Every structure is written in structure tokens, then in C-alpha cells.
Amino acid sequence: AVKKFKPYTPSRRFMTVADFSEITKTEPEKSLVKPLKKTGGRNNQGRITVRFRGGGHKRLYRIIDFKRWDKVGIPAKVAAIEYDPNRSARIALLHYVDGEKRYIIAPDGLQVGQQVVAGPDAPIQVGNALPLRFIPVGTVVHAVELEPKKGAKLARAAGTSAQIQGREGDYVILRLPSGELRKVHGECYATVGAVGNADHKNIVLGKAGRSRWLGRRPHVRGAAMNPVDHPHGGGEGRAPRGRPPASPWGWQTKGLKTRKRRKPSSRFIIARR
Amino acid sequence: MKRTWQPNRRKRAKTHGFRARMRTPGGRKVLKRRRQKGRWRLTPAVR
RNA sequence: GUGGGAGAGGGUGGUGGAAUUCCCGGAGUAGCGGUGAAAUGCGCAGAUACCGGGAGGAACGCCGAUGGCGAAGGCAGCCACCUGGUCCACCCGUGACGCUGAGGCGCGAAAGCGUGGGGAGCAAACCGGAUUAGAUACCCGGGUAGUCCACGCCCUAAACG
RNA sequence: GUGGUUCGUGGAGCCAUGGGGGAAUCUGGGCGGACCACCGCCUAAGGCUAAGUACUCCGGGUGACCGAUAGCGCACCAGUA
RNA sequence: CGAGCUAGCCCUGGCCAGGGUGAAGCUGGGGUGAGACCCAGUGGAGGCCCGAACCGGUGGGGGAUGCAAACCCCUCGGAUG
RNA sequence: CGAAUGCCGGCAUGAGUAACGAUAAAGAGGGUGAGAAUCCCUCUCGCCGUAAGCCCAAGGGUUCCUACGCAAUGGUCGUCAGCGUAGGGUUAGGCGGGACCUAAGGUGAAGCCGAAAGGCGUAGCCGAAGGGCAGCCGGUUAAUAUUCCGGCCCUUCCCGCAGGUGCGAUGGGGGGACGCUCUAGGCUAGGGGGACCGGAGCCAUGGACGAGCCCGGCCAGAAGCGCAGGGUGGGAGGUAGGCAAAUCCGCCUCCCAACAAGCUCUGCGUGGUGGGGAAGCCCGUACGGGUGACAACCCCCCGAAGCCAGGGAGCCAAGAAAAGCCUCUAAGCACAACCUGCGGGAACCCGUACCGCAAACCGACACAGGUGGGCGGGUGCAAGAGCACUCAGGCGCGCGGGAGAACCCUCGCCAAGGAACUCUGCAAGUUGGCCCCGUAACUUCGGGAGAAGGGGUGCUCCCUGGGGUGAUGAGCCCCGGGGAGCCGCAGUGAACAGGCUCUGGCGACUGUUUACCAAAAACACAGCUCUCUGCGAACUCGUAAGAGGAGGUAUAGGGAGCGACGCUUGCCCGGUGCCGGAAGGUCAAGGGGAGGGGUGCAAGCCCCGAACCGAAGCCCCGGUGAACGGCGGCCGUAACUAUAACGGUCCUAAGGUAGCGAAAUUCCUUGUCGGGUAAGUUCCGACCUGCACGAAAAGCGUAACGACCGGAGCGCUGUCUCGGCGAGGGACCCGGUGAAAUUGAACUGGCCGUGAAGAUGCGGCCUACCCGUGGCAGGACGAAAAGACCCCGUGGAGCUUUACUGCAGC
RNA sequence: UCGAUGUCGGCUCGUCGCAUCCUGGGGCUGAAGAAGGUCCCAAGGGUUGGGCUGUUCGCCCAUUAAAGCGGCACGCGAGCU
RNA sequence: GCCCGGAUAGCUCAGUCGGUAGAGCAGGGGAUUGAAAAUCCCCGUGUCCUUGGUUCGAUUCCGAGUCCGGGCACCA
Numbered sequence A: 001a002v003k004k005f006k007p008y009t010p011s012r013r014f015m016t017v018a019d020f021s022e023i024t025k026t027e028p029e030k031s032l033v034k035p036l037k038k039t040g041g042r043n044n045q046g047r048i049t050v051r052f053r054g055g056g057h058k059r060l061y062r063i064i065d066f067k068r069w070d071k072v073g074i075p076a077k078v079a080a081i082e083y084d085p086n087r088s089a090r091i092a093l094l095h096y097v098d099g100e101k102r103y104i105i106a107p108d109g110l111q112v113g114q115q116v117v118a119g120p121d122a123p124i125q126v127g128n129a130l131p132l133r134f135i136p137v138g139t140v141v142h143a144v145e146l147e148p149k150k151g152a153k154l155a156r157a158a159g160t161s162a163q164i165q166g167r168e169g170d171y172v173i174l175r176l177p178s179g180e181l182r183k184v185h186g187e188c189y190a191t192v193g194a195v196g197n198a199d200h201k202n203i204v205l206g207k208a209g210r211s212r213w214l215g216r217r218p219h220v221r222g223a224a225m226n227p228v229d230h231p232h233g234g235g236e237g238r239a240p241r242g243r244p245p246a247s248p249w250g251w252q253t254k255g256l257k258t259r260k261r262r263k264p265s266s267r268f269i270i271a272r273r
Numbered sequence B: 001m002k003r004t005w006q007p008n009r010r011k012r013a014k015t016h017g018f019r020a021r022m023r024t025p026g027g028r029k030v031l032k033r034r035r036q037k038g039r040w041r042l043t044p045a046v047r
Numbered sequence C: 001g002u003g004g005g006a007g008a009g010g011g012u013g014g015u016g017g018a019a020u021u022c023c024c025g026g027a028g029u030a031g032c033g034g035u036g037a038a039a040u041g042c043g044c045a046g047a048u049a050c051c052g053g054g055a056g057g058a059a060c061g062c063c064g065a066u067g068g069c070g071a072a073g074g075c076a077g078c079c080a081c082c083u084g085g086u087c088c089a090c091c092c093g094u095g096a097c098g099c100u101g102a103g104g105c106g107c108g109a110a111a112g113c114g115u116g117g118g119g120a121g122c123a124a125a126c127c128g129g130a131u132u133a134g135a136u137a138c139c140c141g142g143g144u145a146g147u148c149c150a151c152g153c154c155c156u157a158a159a160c161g
Numbered sequence D: 001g002u003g004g005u006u007c008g009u010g011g012a013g014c015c016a017u018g019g020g021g022g023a024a025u026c027u028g029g030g031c032g033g034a035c036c037a038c039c040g041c042c043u044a045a046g047g048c049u050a051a052g053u054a055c056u057c058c059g060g061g062u063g064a065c066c067g068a069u070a071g072c073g074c075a076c077c078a079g080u081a
Numbered sequence E: 001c002g003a004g005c006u007a008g009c010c011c012u013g014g015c016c017a018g019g020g021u022g023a024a025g026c027u028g029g030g031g032u033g034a035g036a037c038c039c040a041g042u043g044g045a046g047g048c049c050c051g052a053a054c055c056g057g058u059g060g061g062g063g064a065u066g067c068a069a070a071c072c073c074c075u076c077g078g079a080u081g
Numbered sequence F: 001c002g003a004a005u006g007c008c009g010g011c012a013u014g015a016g017u018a019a020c021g022a023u024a025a026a027g028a029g030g031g032u033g034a035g036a037a038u039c040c041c042u043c044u045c046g047c048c049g050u051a052a053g054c055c056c057a058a059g060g061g062u063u064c065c066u067a068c069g070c071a072a073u074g075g076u077c078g079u080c081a082g083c084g085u086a087g088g089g090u091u092a093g094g095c096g097g098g099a100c101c102u103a104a105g106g107u108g109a110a111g112c113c114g115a116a117a118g119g120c121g122u123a124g125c126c127g128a129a130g131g132g133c134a135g136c137c138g139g140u141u142a143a144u145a146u147u148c149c150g151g152c153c154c155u156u157c158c159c160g161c162a163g164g165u166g167c168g169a170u171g172g173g174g175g176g177a178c179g180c181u182c183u184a185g186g187c188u189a190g191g192g193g194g195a196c197c198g199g200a201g202c203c204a205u206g207g208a209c210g211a212g213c214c215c216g217g218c219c220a221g222a223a224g225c226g227c228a229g230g231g232u233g234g235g236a237g238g239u240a241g242g243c244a245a246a247u248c249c250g251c252c253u254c255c256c257a258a259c260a261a262g263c264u265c266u267g268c269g270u271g272g273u274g275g276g277g278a279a280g281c282c283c284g285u286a287c288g289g290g291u292g293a294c295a296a297c298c299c300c301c302c303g304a305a306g307c308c309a310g311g312g313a314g315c316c317a318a319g320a321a322a323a324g325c326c327u328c329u330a331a332g333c334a335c336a337a338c339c340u341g342c343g344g345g346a347a348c349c350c351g352u353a354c355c356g357c358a359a360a361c362c363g364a365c366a367c368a369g370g371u372g373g374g375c376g377g378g379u380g381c382a383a384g385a386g387c388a389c390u391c392a393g394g395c396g397c398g399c400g401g402g403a404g405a406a407c408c409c410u411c412g413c414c415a416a417g418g419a420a421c422u423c424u425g426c427a428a429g430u431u432g433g434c435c436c437c438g439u440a441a442c443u444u445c446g447g448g449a450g451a452a453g454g455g456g457u458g459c460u461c462c463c464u465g466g467g468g469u470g471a472u473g474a475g476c477c478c479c480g481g482g483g484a485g486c487c488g489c490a491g492u493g494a495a496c497a498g499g500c501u502c503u504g505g506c507g508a509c510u511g512u513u514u515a516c517c518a519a520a521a522a523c524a525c526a527g528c529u530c531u532c533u534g535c536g537a538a539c540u541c542g543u544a545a546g547a548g549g550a551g552g553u554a555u556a557g558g559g560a561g562c563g564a565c566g567c568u569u570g571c572c573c574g575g576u577g578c579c580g581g582a583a584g585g586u587c588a589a590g591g592g593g594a595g596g597g598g599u600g601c602a603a604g605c606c607c608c609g610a611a612c613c614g615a616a617g618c619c620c621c622g623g624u625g626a627a628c629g630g631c632g633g634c635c636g637u638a639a640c641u642a643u644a645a646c647g648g649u650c651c652u653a654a655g656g657u658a659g660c661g662a663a664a665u666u667c668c669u670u671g672u673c674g675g676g677u678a679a680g681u682u683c684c685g686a687c688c689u690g691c692a693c694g695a696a697a698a699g700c701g702u703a704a705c706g707a708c709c710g711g712a713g714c715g716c717u718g719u720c721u722c723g724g725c726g727a728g729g730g731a732c733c734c735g736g737u738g739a740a741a742u743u744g745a746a747c748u749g750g751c752c753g754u755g756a757a758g759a760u761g762c763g764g765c766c767u768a769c770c771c772g773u774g775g776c777a778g779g780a781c782g783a784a785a786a787g788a789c790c791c792c793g794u795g796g797a798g799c800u801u802u803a804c805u806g807c808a809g810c
Numbered sequence G: 001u002c003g004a005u006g007u008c009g010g011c012u013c014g015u016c017g018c019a020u021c022c023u024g025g026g027g028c029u030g031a032a033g034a035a036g037g038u039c040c041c042a043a044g045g046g047u048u049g050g051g052c053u054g055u056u057c058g059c060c061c062a063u064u065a066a067a068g069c070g071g072c073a074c075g076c077g078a079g080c081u
Numbered sequence H: 001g002c003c004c005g006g007a008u009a010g011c012u013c014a015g016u017c018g019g020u021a022g023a024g025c026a027g028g029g030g031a032u033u034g035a036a037a038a039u040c041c042c043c044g045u046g047u048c049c050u051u052g053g054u055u056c057g058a059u060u061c062c063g064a065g066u067c068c069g070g071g072c073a074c075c076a
């Protein structure tokens, strides 16, 4: 649970790596990988639209199953637990009994050898996906569809989870990882359990290079630039913000709320983060 | 020391070539101008 | 050794109702709170008091005792699992195998500390209203660590009989 | 809401139209500089139409036009080296 | 009209002499009620060490109508990231 | 036209001046020729040799080879040439690319979007130093050769014969198919040694006829075989998944083998055959040819980073695609078709010269610069691609001859002293490899460490331990141990090869930066906090469609600050910002019409318009500090004095907490005191009167780190006292070639005056024959650049904001 | 003098003035001697080495016959820093 | 060197339309106390820094001057 290192270099003393004990399989399921084009944070004009991105290790994409319902009632065995580089989570290999293979994002405590299945049927147990309406109130759950048939959207990230606070009408009340209180539709699938690899938030990158490996290039402060560049640019030696703190595009960055007010999904939200 | 001109033939053709000029309404008008002036080469040499 | 007992003895996982706070719905109006007396605070932007719904944390009333258990520190709703100590009876077994115990090792209330969570009530610090000659206090209104959980520290005490 | 006109919001009509509303077929409609009355003019929401006009790559005629530092950048193998 | 220089990113290749230090793990031994842990041996980690290539450009000298519109010499930084 | 630092051209000055492009280096004989330092040939000398040698790729484009030439190009010369003229020269089914595949990207039927131009975009298509695919050795030309030839091997297409089989695809499935570090076994490349084999010849100068010296002792090769290695289960049954079907693949069950056992694939070896084959001597070759020769052709050792190759281990950052290929079935066909073997036929287009670390490429140059991949021998030095010398090979850098001044550069040495130099030990010196002994404060327990500080190091003989290969032995090779001596000033004997300590500041660290005056204490960095963002996310680019974010989902993403770690981070919410507030005020278009007006005979047509209803914003209520920010003053007081724990009062939104402090901050200032020094404006330690520190524009510390910046000491020095000598390349002279900025014209002295105020040029004196050469820089307000400081201009441009006014955006 | 008169200090190299720091010659003295004070003549020559600071200056150490003051574009950057 | 503020009761400060100037604290006399604080009841009082001037009248307005608080002194 988080390997540490003796300081045999500087930065080897603060480094921390994930513990890979849970990982069964060391190379992926070839039928289940496809290549993914790295952006560099650049859009279809050659233009950077997200700063400080790029470089960092090459990756094969694991195509994973966020619709669990097109397999309704067909059980499957949990074949191995694998490392997916495209996410904080880990991915469970499923062998379905009719012989199809799928990747599911791997819940806490789910272990190899387990039967697992999705539908209005099915036990309320870890790994099993169901329309939300049949999951009993109070159950913690993850990989939640936001609208029906559209795929798992909420609580996919290592350690995250959502909780069922109550039913009202066609909709059920979830508390999201954010802690926002959200109505979601009854027919939206969710699979029971948390996401696991919860240990994940404590890894400590430990050096500059290790950030580079994950494809995040350095990030320069507005404070460090010139007025052409940023609201915080310039001004003889150092200096404070001299105005409300801003983005490079000059909108305010402490507290200013950016959610569009008139959004329709407003009718469906009850709380905050 | 490393200077500004580092010849490469694919580049030269890929970039200033005839088919390139024709591709773009800007470049079609290069040809138009050079032709009107009566340039001997409409387009850089390459090879 | 056998057969029995009593108990808030410890670890784990579950689980119940009362209350407080917040939020939503209702109904209703001019005060509520507070104190020695007040003010700050809250309240016509609809408070307090009342009913219904929800959320969340912490602590377990009666039983409850001047009682019980633990080596101490300590341990108190209920349920199950795991597990320590102990007493009695019968007089069956070993045959002095004992007592203590420098060092060692382990436990060790509260506060505090690290990393995560959690945060209803309470509350150092802090703010504010009183009181006073002053008041960096006692009283009142707020209120952050902390109080709670996990894991690792700290190793103190009027740790007392 | 704007453009056009001499009209720069002006008393601002006219011609055009991005938005809203939305007619009638001669007793119908537009116009004569806000509006109304009178008096006139004209017939929108389909289309075509020579000539008189503009230009000069090209050919020809002519210069009180140049004469090789001029005249075209080029009198010469120049849009070349 | 330019990313044939330069900056960043994308796809696909290549390169980094030799030496040194000796993390985890492992195995053995010791320790314990079990542990923690200790010792050896093994192991071969690292924006680890010395130093070529390669990348640099630190200090000084030279050059200054240069060999050169940024060079030369001595010296110096990195050198599995 | 006389001026415009005018334009264009011509020719001058400087001047026979600087220079002739790396200080690797030359000398002579012969030749050729009108002409020779410069061309050819020989001998001698020198330089490169992880190259300054060899082979790819780019890029260049006839520079290639040959004859005939020397006007210009060549920094001199020129008979020579990368130059002029002319003639020749590049040969492929197997090498590269195309008739194959796909990557990013591009383009783009469908489709979406945009005033026009155009933008996007699925499929498809294009796109390569990636994937796929069949040639090795040697000989030949003046010049091409995996291309021609010789030998030995192979691929695909077509057609046919034989044997086999449900054949059959753009569809299905398998495979292709992958990282980084470390690495095993067996090999090969490559190398060294041999007393063995083969070879012309050699015996000098004191010695040697020798188990002498000198030279070489291979290369390619089908099938088979052999050694090492990669891949790989077999069968049945069930089957709803792999977008039709499948006998395939997936999944479940059972039965056999666990193993290369078999099967298969590849490396190496061996192999029918084919080829090569030194030194030396001669031939004259420019350059090769003859012989050596019927050449030999073998043993040992070292041994890759290459091969077997998809090998194995560990790790986290988790490591292309598509076709070729195999399999499966679908139409359809099964007289087809396909598969295997054999045999004949068929096999296209483009590149191939030459240069290629460079005189042929990029740098206006025959430019000391830049340029990717491979090979890169020997011996020694611990190793090595380092260093020195050297092989193959290649060069002596396209001006020379002399002299032996100053001065300059690069280099050597120095009595005594030893930083006294100076802004500064800048520069130079010292140190320096390996082995052993030894090593402090502090510390995050890794470090600090190569701390510091020492000893050893050559050669000779004797004895002796372990390993590799062999056999368990010799031989070869690797690592050592003990003893006795020998020599010099000196044994890492030449070359390559840290000076060290103490103590502060800043930054934790490795990194990054102003191409070309700044490498830093700046940026970044892990890490900490605030904040936005529920997913068609927020944010960014785009008019839009689209896209990035992300095929991610709050343990995620954006924005901001701070910047490892440690211990911490106080008070103020008045103002500004952000956040919350269903009330109230104000609020635009619109609604509404009390009322009024124009005109008409009227019906009417037309205009104005009060109340009232009416968003966001603002006002107003509150919250908020790792939000913009802010964080006072005066007077008195103690039983010597002094000071003031204490009291009083003004002002404020509140009046700086911890820590720190003359500081990267202290004006007065060299503050005062202590330390260090003979002497200390710097430095270290204290003090606090902090002009004008103080807590994430973070506060105070911190081990380690630093080409950062201070201060001290040891060591050692030409830094210096204070200079001297010596070397080379210049400078000087001679022969050849021959610039430059500058330049009103010049017949161009000194002083004292005068002058627009600093006079060769005017006045008065003085001095002074004409002209050069090597030298020095005081003057010509020397050159250069129409001052960059300063002002001015109703000149410009970047930046800012609660300046004005707009626009995007919301 | 803005179509450029390089600007502090150091170094190197001098040169001049005298309002003389020392040495030479004097007068007065509140000059016993020795040692001074003060003024006069005098510009021939001399006029140290270090610590601090960019410093000029100045303070300090150790000496001295003395440690003189000024000018020369705050002398001197086509002489260096 | 140049511009700004201030001086009002013993202290700290307010205020002034140019006309009769106050707050707190101190201070004085009384009460309370055994006595002293705290508490209570009476109590005042300044020629509003100087010097000119305007005006009928100046703390108030004017112009000078002290002395204290503050800001500045930039390009070279």
C-alpha cells in the first residue's frame, strides 16, 4: 500500500509508488486494446487549447465497458485484475460465460474468481450492475449512468463512489463524490461498490521528471511572465496580484462561479461542490 | 554554425511546388502574378 | 482434569430509539434569546412556539447501586463472532514444578503530534456584548483546532487506597 | 434594426430590408419630404431588350514625345543574370 | 509568403566508451510466543558518482577591415535522463 | 548644379602598405617544359590514425575517366587543377524506391458548417529511416559493378503435368505486435600467440647460421548432417460471444502428453563446388603488372554492444498500425477452384558517375564554423571509443627566401620573498591515476567522503594460493600472495588524470533561460492552499461546424499563489473583489392608457402621453483573509539615577502575534560592542534606536546540493617586490600577389596672446636645410555611428488603469 | 561642441606652480642647552610599505629626513584597466 | 534647500456662521471608610503659539514668524 524508498538519492526519499499487489495480469487483452492518438493538448487547428501538456510515456487504450446492460443476465468470471494507464482506476478482466470478454473498471474488494452480472435481477453485491431503481436505498455504488442508455459517467475514479439517499418518483437521489446532491434517473445503471485503488491519492510523485512521465509539462505562473502574457505579468521585482487574481484570459480565479445559470440540468441538482 | 538554409528536396517541392500553389486561392494567384510578369520559372526548381 | 457459574473484561462487525443542529413542506405573527439586570445576537427578507418529511454526527436515559469486571490506565443501548482473566464443586492427574524480580518487553486517562477521513453538539485560541478602577476573567452572543473513526506517534498524571 | 440619397435622427419622406405583425384586386394599391384634407401622378411584389458609354493585351496613323544615366525594367537572347 | 532557422507538440527510428557506489527484494543465520528487527551472502536500484562520445557554454586569454556577421585556445557544466 | 552622409559611373588617397586563412615541415636528386620552391617520379624528414582512414544517407549535379590547353578562376607560381575545349563513363526479377502495407499528418464519396473565397469530416485514398519482400563470394574497366562475367543459390507471375483437398473474401478469427534496465547459455565478427605449415631473401658495425630475422598461414558455399536456440500441446463434447455463416477463435466440461518429446523456424559449424593468396625482388607503368606458388591455409587463446531473438529476470512511467502469412466459413463453384511437388515460359518503370566531417553539402570564398548512420587494427598505461606512439590508408593545410630589433601572441625556466598584486589569487601554479591505511562537525542516517591526512607504485631472481580453457595434464589466458636483491634526482619516470579547509548569503535538490554582452539568488520542480467544474463539465481555439479537455468524470479536469522538508503562518471585512440574500429603492424595450394635440363636414386617419405592471445591473443586507489589501500616536508614572511592568487620552476597519533584525532590507552609518588582522568602510557574533522585516508577492530554520555571491586560513605560485633569460608564430629585409575605412584642398612647427570662449592656418616672438624608414600615441576638439542621456515634435510605438469611447465575451 | 568634445577611480608615464612636507640659508622667540614656536629666502632633489573600502578622501598598522598642496579636458581609455 | 499639517485648561484632544469655548483625565473642597482605593455630591478655569493687518468686533479671515508632525529632493 504505497511502496516507499530509502533516500539513496534526493527525491528518492519523497517518492512514492502505488502498490501493485492487486495486479494479476501484466500485459493486456489484445482484442481489447486499440491505439490512442496523443494530442499534446492541441485541437484540430494545430493550436494548443490546453496548456502544458505532452511528452510522457506512450499508451495503449483499454476499451472498457461503461454500458453494462447490453449483457443483461449473462454472468461472467473475473479473470484477472489489470493495470490501465489511461486511468486512476484498475480494470477487471471479465470472461462472460457465452465467451465474450470485456473490461470493467475494477471495484474495491472485487477479487479474481468471482461471478459478476448485470440486470434488474442479480444480487446486490460488489461488481453487479443494475438500473438504479432496484438498488436498495443506502447502497454505495459507482460507475453511474447520468441518463439512461448513455453509459457510466459519475464515480469512475480510483477510490470514488456515490451513495443512494432516497427515491423520488422516476428518479433516485444520489450523493456524488463531489458531495453534490443529484437526482438521477431510475433506469440508469450503476454498479455496486466503490472504485477502489483508493490508496491512489497518497502517491507522491517525488520529482519533476515523474510529472513529465504522466505527460504534464511544466507550468509557469502568471506571476512569472510579462504584461503581454498575463494579468499578473511584470512590475519590477516580484509583486502581488495588484488586482483580483486572474486567468491568462483575464477572468477572475478566486470564487467566480462558471456554471451557466440557465442550464436545464439545474432542475435536477440539490447541493454543492 | 548551423545556418538558415538546410536543403531538402521533398520539403522544397511539398512547400513551394506547383501542386501546392494550385491548392490554395492565395497560391493560384502567385502563379497568376508570376505568369503575368512572364517569369521563366513559375515555381522553384527542385532536383 | 471434569462439571458448572458471574461480570460495563478486551478486539471486530452490525444495529435501535430519545435528543440537538441544519435543510424542505405546512400552518401562524411580533417578538424570540439571554441575564443579577442587560446588551451583543436572532426576527416582518416571516424568527420563536407547532405539525409533517429529510440529512448527519456524537452520546446511550430508565435499569443504575454506596453494584460488577480489569494488573493498571480503564470498561455502560442492543445483537453476533472472536478472545482474556476468574470463581465454585468433585478430590481425578503432575509431584516443590514455588515467591520475587535489576535490566528487557508489553500496556498505559486526558491533552498533544503525523497522514487520511469525519464534524451534529461542545469548545482552548480568537471575535463580540456585559461587568469592573481595569477585566487580556468569572456571566452572555459567536467560534477554530480539538472532541469522533483508521492507522502510526507521544508515555505524562492528585496514573491515589 | 440598418443601408442608400445632398440628407450625419433631423420636421425624415423616398428606394432597399435583417426581425415581428400582416392586407386587399380598380370602390384595389404606391407617390408628390412627418400627419390630415383636397387636388394630381403612377400602377409594386416575374423576365428580356440593340444603340449612343468604358477599356486597350492586340493592329494601324500621327507627334513644338525620348534619343542609350533618356525613353518601357528590357533598343542588346530581360522579367534574364 | 514563411516553422528547410528557431520554439513547442505529434508519428516513426537511432545513440549514450569505461569505471564506481550498492536501494528494495531474495536466501541463509540470529531474535521472538509470533513478531518487529539484526547480521551475512546474493541482488543491481537511482532526474546517484567519475569520465569519453554526444549535448553544453563557466572563467580567462586571443580575435575585433576575424578563419568566423558569435570563431579559436586553455578551463569548465550535464553525460539512463 | 558645386554641395542634398544626393543618384549612376569612372578614377584617385591610404600603399607597394595590412594581408596571402590554423606553427603537421621540410630537404635533395631525376623528369617535363618557352618558363618550375609550387607539375611527375625517387629517396630522406614530418603530421593524422574512434582519423585528418573506410563505407551508407542527405544535399550537390559531370565536379568522374581520358586527350589537348593556361586567358581568366587558384589569395604566389603553374607545364598542375575541383578551371577552358573535346571524347568517353553510370548496365540489376534478388541493392534502394515504385507496380505492397499502414503512422502522425494530409486529403476526403457520406455528412455538417460557412457572405464569397472557404472551414470541418466517417469510410476510403495519399503518406515512411517503421512493417512486409528473393544474392553471397570472386574476377573484370581509364572510368560501373551484390548491376557485366564466373561459380554457387533463390523469388514472383503465367501455362502445363502429377499427387492432394469442400474450394472459395474486401467478411470472422489468429498472428504480425512491440517499453525500460539488467542478463544466461551457445556462437560469429574481430583480435593476439604458435617451437606447427609456406615464403623470396637477409647475417651489416662488436656478436648471432639461430628451435634466427622479415613475411603470410584464408573467403563464399545449396541438400544433408551436427551444435546451440526461438516458436508450439493433442483429443472429444457442449456453445446463446467474435454485428451473416464458420468445422475457426472465445467460453465451460471430460480424456490423454508435460516434456522441445515431437513437430516447425532460425543462427552457427561442416559441407559437392568456387575463389583468394604476403613479404621481397624485377618490370619503367602515370599506376599497376610479372614472380614469389602446385604457396601454406593448421593448433591455441581472448572475444563482442552482433547472431540464435518473439531468449530470461526485475521494475512502472505499462510500452503503433495495417498488409504479407495461417485459419474459418459466405455468396458462387464444385468439369471450377485451391493446396503440394515438378517442368517450361514470363519478370516492367526510376536510381546507380563523382564529392560526401567536405576545395564538390549549409556558411557571398578552395571560409580554422555547422552536418545523421556504420566500420574504426596494434602495443602500453587498472579499464576505455581516454592518452602516447603506430598499421591499412591519408595528409604536410596553394606564397616563398632570409634576418634573429622594439613590441605582440603562444610557450619554457628562474636567486630570496611568497598575495606584499588586485575590485578579486583574475591569471598561472599546486593537486592529480590505481592500491592500501585513515577520515570530523553535522545529518533527512542515504550522506557529509575522493572529507581531511598519509604510505605504496620500477626492474631481477626464488617460492607460492585461486580461476577460465583444456582432460582431471601441458600450453595459453585471468586475479593475486610471500621472500631476497638491482639502479637513478626521480619508478601512474613520457602522455591523459581533484588543490584543500573553515565560515556566512540566496536557492532545497537534478533540471531550464536572455540563438549573439546576464546561467543567476531568475524560471521550473515535487509538495502545500484557495478556487472553479455533475459532464453536451468548467476552461481554451473557431463566425460556425467542429475540436482540444478526454474516449477522462471530482482520488478527475481548469485557473491562481506559494514552492523539498521542519516548526509555523496571528489581528482587521470599513473600502475593492468574489459569494449569499424569493423583501425594499432604482431600473431599459415592451405592456398600459388618465389625459392632450394635428387635420377632416363627419365617420375617421395620424401624433404625444400620466398612473400603474416591468429583467439583469446598481443601491441595500450579510459572508469571505493561502481574496485586492491594511496592521497608529501623544502624556504621565517606581524611595539615587536611569528606565518604565502601571495609569490617561486622541485616532482607526483593526493597530504587527511568533519569529527575525544595521539584514540581497539601516537613511544618519565605517552605529556600538565582541571576534578575526600589526592594521579590517568588507566578513562573522551580538545588541535593537526595524529611515523603511514579519508569516503562502509566505515567516524562521535546515542536512545535501551550486561553473551562483560574500569572508578567513593552509598549500603553491612571475599576481607582485621586479624584473631577467630562452623558444616558436608575427613584426623587420628580399622576391611574388596586393586590400581597407578615411579623404574640401594643403606648401599641415613651438610659445604667449587673440579669435564663436581649447589655433599648423590670425598677432607678436621663437625655432626650423630637402626626403624617407622602424617605432610611441599627446594633438589634428583624430575615425566610426545625422547622441541611444537631455529636451523639443499638438512624431511614433509596447505596456497599465476605478482616463474617454467602443468591440468580443458574459 | 547633442551629423558624439567617452564619463569616477586605479595603473603607466611624466611635466609644471609655490601658497615649501623634508633637506639648504635666515630673522624674531615667552631662544640656557637639546628640542620647538612663528615668520623670511628657496622649486635643485626628495617626498616609504601595508590593513579597510570601487572609492577620491579618509581612518588604522609599521616606518621616515619627510610621508607637501595644487594645475596640466577632476593630465593621461586611437596607452591599459 | 522645497511643499504640507499643527499649536485651544495641567495632560490628551474636540470645536468655532468672525460675538457668551467644551469632553475626558488630572486638580481643589465635602461625603463614604477604622484607614486607603473604587464610589457619590459640590467646584471651577483659558488673556485659543507669536506678530502685523481687515473689521464695529478676530481663537476663527488675511499676510508674515517661530517650534513641532509630515512629504519631497527625480534624469543625469
Ligand SMILES: NC[C@H]1O[C@H](O[C@H]2[C@H](O[C@@H]3O[C@H](CO)[C@@H](O)[C@H](N)[C@H]3O)[C@@H](O)[C@H](N)C[C@@H]2N)[C@H](N)[C@@H](O)[C@@H]1O
Residues within 6 Å of the ligand: C004, C005, C006, C083
Ligand atoms: N479461557 C476460555 C474462556 O474463559 C472464560 O469462559 C468461562 C465461561 O464464562 C463466560 O464467558 C462469556 C464470555 O465473556 C460470558 O458471556 C459469560 N457470561 C461467562 O460466564 C463460563 O461460563 C464457563 N462455565 C467457564 C469458562 N472458562 C471467559 N469468559 C471466556 O471469554 C473464554 O473463552
Ligand SMILES: NC[C@H]1O[C@H](O[C@H]2[C@H](O[C@@H]3O[C@H](CO)[C@@H](O)[C@H](N)[C@H]3O)[C@@H](O)[C@H](N)C[C@@H]2N)[C@H](N)[C@@H](O)[C@@H]1O
Residues within 6 Å of the ligand: F644, F647, F655
Ligand atoms: N510611554 C509609556 C508607555 O506607553 C504605552 O503604554 C500605554 C498604552 O499605549 C498603547 O500602546 C499600544 C502599542 O504598544 C498602542 O497600539 C495603543 N494605541 C497605545 O494606547 C495605553 O493604551 C495604555 N492605556 C497605557 C499604557 N501604559 C506603550 N505601549 C509603552 O511601551 C510605553 O512604555
Ligand SMILES: NC[C@H]1O[C@H](O[C@H]2[C@H](O[C@@H]3O[C@H](CO)[C@@H](O)[C@H](N)[C@H]3O)[C@@H](O)[C@H](N)C[C@@H]2N)[C@H](N)[C@@H](O)[C@@H]1O
Residues within 6 Å of the ligand: G047
Ligand atoms: N597618483 C598618480 C601619480 O602620483 C604621483 O605623481 C603625481 C604627483 O603626486 C605626488 O608625487 C610625489 C612623488 O612621488 C609623491 O611624493 C607625492 N606623495 C604625490 O602626491 C603630483 O604632485 C603631480 N601633480 C601629478 C603626478 N602624476 C606618482 N609619482 C606617480 O607615479 C603616480 O602615478
Ligand SMILES: [Mg+2]
Residues within 6 Å of the ligand: A044, A045
Ligand atoms: Mg485535423
Ligand SMILES: [Mg+2]
Residues within 6 Å of the ligand: A044, A045, A046
Ligand atoms: Mg490545418
Ligand SMILES: [Mg+2]
Residues within 6 Å of the ligand: A002, A016, A202, A203, A204
Ligand atoms: Mg504516499
Ligand SMILES: [Mg+2]
Residues within 6 Å of the ligand: A216, A219
Ligand atoms: Mg500540476
Ligand SMILES: [Mg+2]
Residues within 6 Å of the ligand: A219, A220, A221
Ligand atoms: Mg509554476
Ligand SMILES: [Mg+2]
Residues within 6 Å of the ligand: A224, A225, A226
Ligand atoms: Mg520576468
Ligand SMILES: [Mg+2]
Residues within 6 Å of the ligand: none
Ligand atoms: Mg502572444
Ligand SMILES: [Mg+2]
Residues within 6 Å of the ligand: A227, A228, A230, A231
Ligand atoms: Mg494585461
Ligand SMILES: [Mg+2]
Residues within 6 Å of the ligand: A231, A232, A233, A234, A235, A239, A240, A241, A242
Ligand atoms: Mg501585477
Ligand SMILES: [Mg+2]
Residues within 6 Å of the ligand: A236, A237, A238, A239
Ligand atoms: Mg519590490
Ligand SMILES: [Mg+2]
Residues within 6 Å of the ligand: A223, A234, A235, A236, A237, A238, A239
Ligand atoms: Mg516580477
Ligand SMILES: [Mg+2]
Residues within 6 Å of the ligand: A251, A258
Ligand atoms: Mg467567463
Ligand SMILES: [Mg+2]
Residues within 6 Å of the ligand: none
Ligand atoms: Mg544566406
